[PDB]
Amino acid sequence: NLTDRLSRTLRNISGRGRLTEDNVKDTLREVRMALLEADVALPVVREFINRVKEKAVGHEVNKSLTPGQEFVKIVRNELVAAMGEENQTLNLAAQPPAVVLMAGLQGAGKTTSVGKLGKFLREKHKKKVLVVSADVYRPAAIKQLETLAEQVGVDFFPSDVGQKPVDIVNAALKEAKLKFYDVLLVDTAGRLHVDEAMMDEIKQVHASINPVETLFVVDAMTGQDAANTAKAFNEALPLTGVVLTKVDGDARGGAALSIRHITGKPIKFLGVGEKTEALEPFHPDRIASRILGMXXXXXXXXXXXXXXXXXXXXXXXXXXXXXXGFDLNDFLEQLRQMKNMGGXXXXXXXXXXXXXXXXXXXXXXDDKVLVRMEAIINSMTMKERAKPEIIKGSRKRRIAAGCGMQVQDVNRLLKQFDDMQRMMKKMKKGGXXXXXXXXXXXXXXXXXXX
RNA sequence: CCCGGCGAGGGGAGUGAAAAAGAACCUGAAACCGUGUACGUACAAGCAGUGGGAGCACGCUGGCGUGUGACUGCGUACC
Ligand SMILES: Nc1nc2c(ncn2[C@@H]2O[C@H](COP(=O)(O)OP(=O)(O)NP(=O)(O)O)[C@@H](O)[C@H]2O)c(=O)[nH]1
Ligand SMILES: [Mg+2]
Ligand SMILES: [Mg+2]
Ligand SMILES: [Mg+2]
Ligand SMILES: [Mg+2]
Ligand SMILES: [Mg+2]
Ligand SMILES: [Mg+2]
Ligand SMILES: [Mg+2]
Ligand SMILES: [Mg+2]
Ligand SMILES: [Mg+2]
Ligand SMILES: [Mg+2]
Ligand SMILES: [Mg+2]
Ligand SMILES: [Mg+2]
Ligand SMILES: [Mg+2]
Ligand SMILES: [Mg+2]
Ligand SMILES: [Mg+2]
Ligand SMILES: [Mg+2]
Ligand SMILES: [Mg+2]
Ligand SMILES: [Mg+2]
Missing domain, CATH: 3.40.50.300 (P-loop containing nucleotide triphosphate hydrolases)
Incomplete structure (x- = not known):
């Protein structure tokens, strides 16, 4: 788990403006002690970090002068060429x-x-x-x-x-x-x-x-x-x-x-x-x-593996939404298909833009949540799935009792399906480039987290 | 949690001494608007009360209060 140590390290660097060579040094030392904590070839730790040290001295970038982008980029690309130069x-x-x-x-x-x-x-x-x-x-x-x-x-x-x-x-x-x-x-x-x-x-x-x-x-x-x-x-x-x-x-x-x-x-x-x-x-x-x-490479590889296992099923959900519109049938199909490709670490690593705002300790258990959704929507009569707006109190008592879970959870899941219904409609009406560019990342003010 | 439009508002739940303390928030008067119950009112003329007064209702312990007021005497607001 270098990201704990390497995060404090290279994030530390990415803070300080026009960094002294001394915190450059200390950071290199923490990469050394980090790879030492990883039990990676200790002499090769020393060698690698000496290389990173020599590389990190004289770089300039007009885009962003930040030295942390330099240490992250250098450690990255250097591990890249040492590990075989993007051979995927x-x-x-x-x-x-x-x-x-x-x-x-x-x-x-x-x-x-x-x-x-x-x-x-x-x-x-x-x-x-x-x-x-x-x-x-x-x-x-x-x-x-x-x-x-x-x-x-x-x-x-x-x-x-x-x-x-x-x-x-x-x-x-x-x-x-x-x-x-x-x-x-x-x-x-x-x-x-x-x-x-x-x-x-x-x-x-x-x-x-x-x-x-x-x-x-x-x-x-x-x-x-x-x-x-x-x-x-x-x-x-x-x-x-x-x-x-x-x-x-x-x-x-x-x-x-x-x-x-x-x-x-x-x-x-x-x-x-x-x-x-x-x-x-x-x-x-x-x-x-x-x-x-x-990661940009693992983002394209997990979106291309998700898209490969889900191609015929998102075309099945798009054909049923073309005929009957978006229902809990098309949503449930999405759920089982989504549970088959399921993993959390390959999902958060695909999106760096959302992971910059939220803690990296964020994890939803996909095996739990997904199969839970499949189960709850397995507790509905076919009319309640094709016509979700009729689901009521006694109905959610029945659904909650069927899968052996809490009514609150069913409320939460129908909430999710409501949001995805809306999103399906917004995707349906607007052009792809406009609906993808008009998505807003909301701060309740530029002041962060509040 | 539930009804509703992912509303408005409401009802439970929970906090609290108290939520007829819920932000349309101490106390919460009158005018003004209502729902409920008793009584009276569809052949009856007028500053609408006062004097007399039957019945009916409700309280009491055959009488005493309370509400109502059919019917008749007198009766043209205040500044
Ligand atoms: N989590 C995880 N486990 C792995 C991975 N690759 C192999 N394993 C596991 O590691 C264990 C050893 O794997 P095995 O294939 O027997 O290794 P081997 O090198 O053939 N052993 P031997 O030298 O005795 O022949 C097995 O439990 C296996 O399931 C991996 O990428 N991830
Ligand atoms: Mg073997
Ligand atoms: Mg409300
Ligand atoms: Mg209490
Ligand atoms: Mg008021
Ligand atoms: Mg007070
Ligand atoms: Mg008040
Ligand atoms: Mg009042
Ligand atoms: Mg009042
Ligand atoms: Mg006559
Ligand atoms: Mg008469
Ligand atoms: Mg008259
Ligand atoms: Mg009298
Ligand atoms: Mg009595
Ligand atoms: Mg009496
Ligand atoms: Mg009397
Ligand atoms: Mg009289
Ligand atoms: Mg007089
Ligand atoms: Mg007269």
């Missing part, structure tokens, strides 16, 4: 065959990441995927891959602990070339970088498969040893890329920076939940912005 769109280069391996320390997230890639590339590539587990060591690891593969709808190549990993992956590659697959995901056992028999074993594995891609998997909570791990794995194995996992934790995962300092290999993907859908393309703009608290 690029990802991995696809050839008609592709063979990718997942390697790294015990428990970093390799098996999970393999299935995430499977799902993601299954969606984007429109092609066929085969996966295989080279892990004969961890109990039930193969079964884990089989389960994940069955869940993501990806062909699974069987293997058991009684075999040799080389023979297994050789068989897998053979079957794959025979059955005309393209993307191949090979999940390997977790291993210490200082374990020679294992590292040799998978040097042999790589030698047998001849992969186009070797991906090192990093827990974002990985410590100072990262630079030592990445190098080791890059010296024997050598890796062509990096995946950074568990970024949904408060760990800042700048260890990958060390990993990208030694290796020089791009970081392709951000693991952002425990679910298969949780593979994101990595992007330094997104991780650095995510740290800083306000």
